[PDB]
Symmetry: none
Subunit: 34 residues, 20 copies
């Protein structure tokens, strides 16, 4: 059997974001002019 | 069998966002002018 | 069988947002002028 | 002056949670028995 | 002066939760038995 | 003056959580028995 | 003046969490028994 | 059997983001003009 | 003046977490028994 | 059997990001003009 | 076991106040004009 | 075992206040005009 | 074992205040005009 | 004339005791045996 | 004239005791045996 | 005239004790045996 | 074993404040105009 | 005239004790046997 | 074993403050105009 | 006129004690036997 503990489980203060889950692609073409 | 504990379960203070779940793609074309 | 505990279950203070669930795509074309 | 753009402003699909804002402390004593 | 844009303003689809605002503390003592 | 762009602003698909903001402390004493 | 671009701004797909902001301390005493 | 503990489980203060999970590709063509 | 670009700005797919920001200390006394 | 402990488990203050998990490729063609 | 003696126990004349116990935060914005 | 004696225990005349116990934060913005 | 004696225990006249105990942060922005 | 402001006046959260006022003496002969 | 501001006036969180006021003497003869 | 500001006035978090005021003498003869 | 004696224990007249205990951070931005 | 600012006024976090005020003498004859 | 004697233990007249204990950081930006 | 700023005024974190004020003498005859 399996006993799995992951993420931020039982943490003390989860003040950062947690990871998402993306099943698909990213096409990115930003254009930045300073 | 499986015993799974994940996310921010049993946390102390989940002040950051949690991860979403996206099943699909992202096409992104931002244009930033400072 | 499965025993699953996730999200912010049993948390202490869930002051951040929780993750949504999006089954579909995002087309994004913002234009920012400072 | 200040021009500030933050958070998930102008995003394309904000499917994850956003960050909260906690002004105070977290005392956490979870006990997990698998 | 200040021009501030934050949160999920002008977003495309805010399907995740947004962050709350907690001014106070969290004492948490969950007990999980699988 | 200041022109600031941060967070996940103008992103394409923010499927992970964003960072919270915690002004206070975390005392954490989890006890895990597998 | 200042032109600052940080975080995951203008990213293509921010599927990991973003960093929080903690102004305070962490006292941690986990006890793990496998 | 397996006893697995990962992520930021049982942490003291998870103020950085956690890792997402991307099953798909990234095509990126940013153009930056200072 | 200053033109600063940092973090995972303009990235292609930010699937790892980003760095938080902790202004305070960490006292840690974990006890692990395999 | 296996007893595995990894990531930033039982850490004291995880203020850096954690590693994501990417199953797919990266094609990158940035163009930077200072 | 523990034998604890604290506060003003067994004192001779407790004419000052004793300490309270506040589990939560204080936001204070007094304005004093002499 | 532990034998602990603290506070103003067994004192002779506790005419000053004793220390409280605050588990949470203080945000303070006084404005004094003489 | 431990024999601990602290605070103003067994003192003769505790006319000053005793120390509190704050588990959390202080943000302070006073403005004084003489 | 006199304008006097003292004590914990206008405070934000007075969780410690305040000082008493003792006009008289203290004779103290505690005997502590651990 | 006089404008006096003292004590913990206008403070943000007075979690320590405040000073008393003793007009008289202290004779102290504790005897501690560990 | 006089404008006086002292003590822990306008402080951010007064978690230590404040000073008392003793107008009289202290005769002290402790005897400590470890 | 340990025999510890600290603070102002067994003192003769503790007319100054005692030290507090702060587990968290201080951000301070006073502005003083004489 | 006089504008005086002293003590821990306008401080950020006064976690140490403040000074008392003793107008009188101290006769001290401790006897310590280790 | 250990026999420890510290602080202002067994003192004759502790009219100065005692040291606090701060586990966390201080960010300070005072601005003084005479 | 006089503009005086002293003590730990406007400090960032006053975790040490502050100085008292003793107007009188100290006669001290400790006897230490190790």
């Amino acid at each position: 059997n399996m006993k799995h503990m992951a993420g931020a489980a039982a943490a003390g203060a989860v003040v950062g974001g947690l990871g998402g889950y993306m099943l698909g692609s990213a096409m990115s073409r930003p254009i930045i002019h300073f």
